[PDB]
Write a protein that binds this ligand. Sequence first.
Ligand SMILES: Nc1ncnc2c1ncn2[C@@H]1O[C@H](COP(=O)(O)OP(=O)(O)O)[C@@H](O)[C@H]1O
Lengths: 95, 387, 70
Amino acid sequence: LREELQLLQEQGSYVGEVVRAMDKKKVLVKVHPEGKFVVDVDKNIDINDVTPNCRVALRNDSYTLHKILPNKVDPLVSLMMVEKVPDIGGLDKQI
Amino acid sequence: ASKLPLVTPHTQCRLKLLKLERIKDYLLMEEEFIRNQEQMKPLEEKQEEERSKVDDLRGTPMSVGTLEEIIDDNHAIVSTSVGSEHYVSILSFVDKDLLEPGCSVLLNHKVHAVIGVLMDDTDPLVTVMKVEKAPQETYADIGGLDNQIQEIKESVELPLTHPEYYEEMGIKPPKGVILYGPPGTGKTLLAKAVANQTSATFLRVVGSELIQKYLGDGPKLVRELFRVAEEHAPSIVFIDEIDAIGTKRYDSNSGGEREIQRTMLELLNQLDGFDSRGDVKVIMATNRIETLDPALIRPGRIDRKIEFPLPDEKTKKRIFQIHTSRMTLADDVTLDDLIMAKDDLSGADIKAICTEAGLMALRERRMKVTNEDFKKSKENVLYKKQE
Amino acid sequence: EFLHAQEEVKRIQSIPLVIGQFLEAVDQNTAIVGSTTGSNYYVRILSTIDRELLKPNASVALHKHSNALV
Ligand SMILES: Nc1ncnc2c1ncn2[C@@H]1O[C@H](COP(=O)(O)OP(=O)(O)O)[C@@H](O)[C@H]1O
């Protein structure tokens, strides 16, 4: 508790989305309103970890990746179409 | 890469042997003299020294910019993602050859200098219009065409395959080809056949799709079409169904029809107006042939007009045999019952027959084949034409 | 000493912070917020806030310099 007062006297943690990476441990990431940047990856993170269309913790000074933030929900997978129990006067001929 | 421009002998001239033997001994000499570098002093101060030095000279946050204009040698005008446009100089690090307007670029933070260039994507248009792979059957699928195949072959296939007849005389090949005849003839068959057995790119085009609710794109679609076909690679363009879209100026009216007149106009000048395209193969499909614009009909635009006849009883026995090749066949059937009876039935009709068998027999889930399958099938297609 | 600790953290606000909106949280004491400045950020949170106040993008405040959920 006593130490935090300076800790949250801190700023720079940007948030990004990776379109896709390329060679030399780099990626292509667009910012929320802004354009797309080619940046550096973190020593603790892996290139194979970088999946396209995923958020990443960004620096504000060097825009260095801090942590590949988890997706919310795969929207098609949250809107996954129903496979309910598949159990009509007028509709028998077309049957 | 452009090691020697001379190809002038075009033969086994001792000139050429002297040429390629000299170039050979030069290459060996270079490979050996450079070979004696890693022998006396094999060193590696030219991989990560220059690469690392410039990777640190240039920056991280590699802001992606957009080219606007090119001026002189080093300074150009760029545009940021929002519109802030800077008069920034470029480094001798990016390929100056692949640097044209309308291209993504890499910029610096402080000076915003052009650092690198981003390679372009594959445009959606190619994915939309180009038949990506060999779509359908090869030359085992023909019902019958020999003069057609000859014309299209020596017009396209023989030229590209063996380009040692046209540069002997300096005679260029014919440009345009009109494939016409009654419907259901197999125009799609031959087009997809040459597209199957081919070495250059292929494009398929429909004509009904050249009408926008927006006003006057049209020739936009045409010009971008031929632009992609030309810029992409050796291009084999194919447009089917130009008859219901480019016939003639029937009444010289307005309101959409005039728009189509403008569009086919742009397909005319764009077809061949100025500074001849080159490596631009063009092939056109039509059902009717008389209601066509003769300005497109004239030479320069189309040099081969091919008729599509309808065989009578000779190739039909192979058409029923192809459309019945991959199917059971009980001994109760004989193809001559229907092949030896008519003499104009289209291959589309043989297809509707040999498929109508697959509908009849297995609608009832009976055994392989019966002769009445071909009887009711042939009569059914008889009402398919007659009705 | 702990109760003296909670109060002394209170100097961080001082009022003029910013009006933003909570968006989502990745994990313990760190979340994402889209400010009314048009942009979006990744931030930490104070341990004082009760975690029952979340859900449907609540109105939140943030530091000018730090831009942290206070
Ligand atoms: N000689 C043939 N051998 C096999 N199939 C044929 C033959 N002639 C026509 N067909 C069938 O008829 C159809 C007509 O093709 P095509 O002439 O390209 O259509 P359209 O006349 O509408 O342009 C083809 O898809 C093919 O399946």
